[PDB]
Design a protein around this ligand. Structure first.
Ligand code: CA
Ligand code: CA
Ligand code: CA
Ligand code: CA
Ligand code: FE
Ligand code: FE
Ligand code: FE
Ligand code: FE
Lengths: 293, 293, 293, 293
């Protein structure tokens, strides 16, 4: 029972035309629907649900909410009961609040971000199928992102004021959503302050992550690639589409994943990383990174 | 709760000297202990428990048993209760039956293979550590296998006699051990016969697998590699060590993984495969392969 | 002065429709012209001349001739003079004998194969251009072969009858065409018989190659790929197009290149190999392979 | 006849201990001799001559001279005659001026750099051999650089003062040493000024290169790696050895090669790049890069 994986992220964009072509031409996503409010829904080729990204028209960048898929409908009532006993108010959005999406349990993380849990989303299948499928589809565009892999949230952190929502988010998703901690970055005196945490429900190194910051916001959303080669191909695609790159291709010590950071036309940061890195396991020791490194 | 991943495989070897150097020089494992009965225990560099492979002296090849690690000790009593309600007799080996290994729940699969579940094995840590670790260790030998990934068992199957232990094993590990089916190979009229099944507890495509055969036995044990390049490097290592190769480097339609099949000096088949392939998910449709392919 | 590289190979095909779609869909070549005799001319994307492959309709497979490009027109008279002093009759085909192709010096190798040298072929440029070009073109099909790299000829060899055209071809192309030997396979007593030779004009390991055989013929023509990954992608393409594979993906000890062998619909063998392997140099010792290996 | 490839580069280092361990541990070179003046000579594993790098103790960084190997001894007299007819004074250092090195033709490029040509250097062979060799050697250290590939020189350039030694060097090595231009970077009005040139004798994209600068000096020396993966491995090695990186792993539009720039302990810049990129050919159009890009 419980959370399976990240379900979708809803992003604020200023230019919908430029944002849609970015996630299509650079990341290889396909648009699956547009609602009557102007929001655009896209999915990756190796995903089988209706969408993993929502672009909403806005006057600014940022994130609206973050959604995670749970195993079955009855998990929503159980998780809801755990969350409110912890002290977080929840509410249940009924099915149809978002198109092609079932009912959703809505609540705010301690850091202030809105998080949703759903059990039901429309099945459309992957672009390769499931009866004698090919390993990859033809006509793939751009980097050919497999799936939306995880999301790193900037969480308000003021050690002098006694505020560390990275720690509070980390406790919340572990005790209420049964995530387990895989890696952490420790700062402060003797590493007594959690500045970055990576947590998992799958056996990939992280499905959610929190990094400290002056205010709560969105650091980036990330997309999975197969190999070190596909990262290089992704860098070539970004060069052809004139994409503003943040960090050049380099292996992250975290996740052991080789990654590229770049932006969409509205300023939201995106990551294409390759490789599993390691098998995340509930009995695996937490990889600790110290501030001096 | 429940099974985490494959824990170890115990293999019968005829020449212990030749078998130990094979798993050390070809696969990159390290020997961690030898018991007073002559059995040798080895682990991979990216594993943190004491051992994942047991070599036992014998007059023949084959497998002794297969072991899977569970989340906590109390899971053994719960799984034991489910297994016997299904109709499989179990027994509890106490801690110390194997060195550095806690108590084990022992039972036979419908196909006749002996399977064990343990919760506790001695921690020794990975070869890269967990405080600011490197992505890979220096002095790595051979293919540098990350971890024992899965095991494919040959399961007795006689469709005319009404015997299909691939199906019975598949039902057993799903209903009793809460595995979920990720891929299958269907044969017979209209694909009405399961000849091969792949099942998972992690989010890797398969942690156990069953293939039909005239008699029940061991098809191969498999080891994980990072990338397509490490497979090539593995093929070069096998050429330097004069290893009997079964299948040349080629991508498997199953798992989407690029793999090599080869043998140890006693005849047991080994696999080095690279890549996650896809994220196995309980809501993902089962990849079906038909006999005509 | 002298030979630059392999220029084109003319192959006999039985089904022109099936052969053209093979070299287009599998190897990624593009058809550039068809003459009034039904012959089809194709080039690779990273080539700048008009064509590197000629498909001629025929009732059998095999090779018509092999063509190499020389640095300047005046090299043809000089090479012609060296060849006839060696004892090989030559003839000069005038410009236009083949469409878009200048005059050609024609002669037969000692093994009996027809070889041609030209200095002038129509320029059409590569598919990426030469003013701020991209590293690779979009819409690339199949394996995306960079260029026709080399050709391995089966050369009549009968050691008991005193016939070894592999040796005679090797002496001919070295003394007359200033090729240099990079690798060889030695067989017979103490390696006193050259069974396979690889020779170069470029600094790639081989631009022509000869292997012994009962009769003189065509072993394969080969196409260059960038990396180990592109070989895997090539294997996936051949699986999608139902291509008859000869040898699975494996690294060749020769050339150090990772390669795949496969056939076109008429039976001619093709090779897609990746990597430079090493820098061929006139002062580099000849890599010798012995029969026992 | 003529130049084969870059032969060696002589660098000034301030800390010989720190410099030698850098080229050994990071680049994988091996020290082959030390002369009585304190100079240290190193070679790469896939080279067969005595050394490709000379470290000389000094109070500053920079380059002493650059050396290229020619095909035969008699080429030195012929090249010497061409060079002085062009207007460059030459001198002949006799054999033994450098240990294990034959006689050398010495002269200064128009940019002021000292260049040497030799025909004879002591043979020691590659680390894999030449009788049934392995594709790569065991116990390889660091990035495992195959060979010193090329050298980029900063050449004094003052367009207002009428000084452009990039152009003068480019004319010199083409007309006197029979190099051919493969790529160029054009700046100024309408691209009427050569700011960077790449030239070849091999069929690799460049064996020497010149970039404009206020003063003449050394930009970097470069080492060849096989694949995109070996570049990643190189970045991991530099991280383990605490190497000052200049440019993160990224594909260069020039050469199409994926590269890393970094420094030795004395400040000299080094490059590890992978891949052939394209086959350099005397009939290939010069790849032109414009200033706006
Ligand atoms: Ca993940
Ligand atoms: Ca697995
Ligand atoms: Ca070649
Ligand atoms: Ca070069
Ligand atoms: Fe990330
Ligand atoms: Fe397997
Ligand atoms: Fe070949
Ligand atoms: Fe360079």
């Amino acid at each position: 029972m419980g959370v399976l994986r990240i379900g979708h992220a809803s992003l604020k964009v200023m230019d919908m035309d430029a944002a849609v072509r970015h996630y299509e031409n650079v990341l290889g996503m396909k648009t699956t629907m547009k609602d009557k409010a102007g929001n655009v829904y896209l999915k990756c080729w190796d995903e089988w649900d209706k969408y993993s990204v929502i672009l909403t028209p806005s006057d600014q960048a940022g994130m609206n909410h973050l959604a995670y898929k749970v195993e079955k409908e009855a998990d929503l009532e159980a998780l809801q009961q755990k969350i409110e006993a912890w002290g977080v108010k929840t509410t249940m959005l009924d099915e149809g609040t978002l198109p092609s999406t079932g009912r959703m349990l809505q609540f705010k993380l301690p850091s202030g971000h809105e998080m949703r849990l759903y059990a039901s989303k429309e099945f459309v299948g992957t672009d390769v199928g499931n009866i004698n499928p090919d390993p990859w589809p033809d006509g793939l565009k751009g980097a050919g992102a497999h799936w939306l892999d995880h999301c790193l949230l900037v969480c308000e952190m003021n050690p002098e004021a006694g505020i560390n929502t990275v720690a509070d988010n980390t406790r919340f998703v572990t005790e209420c959503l049964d995530f387990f901690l895989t890696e952490q970055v420790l700062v402060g005196p003797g590493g007594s302050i959690q500045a970055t945490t990576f947590l998992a429900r799958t056996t990939t190194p992280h499905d959610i992550a929190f990094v400290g910051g002056p205010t709560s916001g969105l650091h980036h959303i990330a997309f999975f690639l197969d190999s070190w080669h596909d990262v290089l191909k992704a860098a070539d695609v970004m060069a052809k589409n004139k994409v503003r790159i943040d960090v050049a291709p380099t292996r992250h010590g975290i996740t052991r994943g080789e990654t590229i950071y770049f932006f969409d036309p509205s300023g939201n940061r995106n990551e294409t990383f390759a490789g599993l890195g390691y098998l995340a396991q509930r009995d695996r020791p937490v990889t600790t990174w110290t501030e001096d490194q």
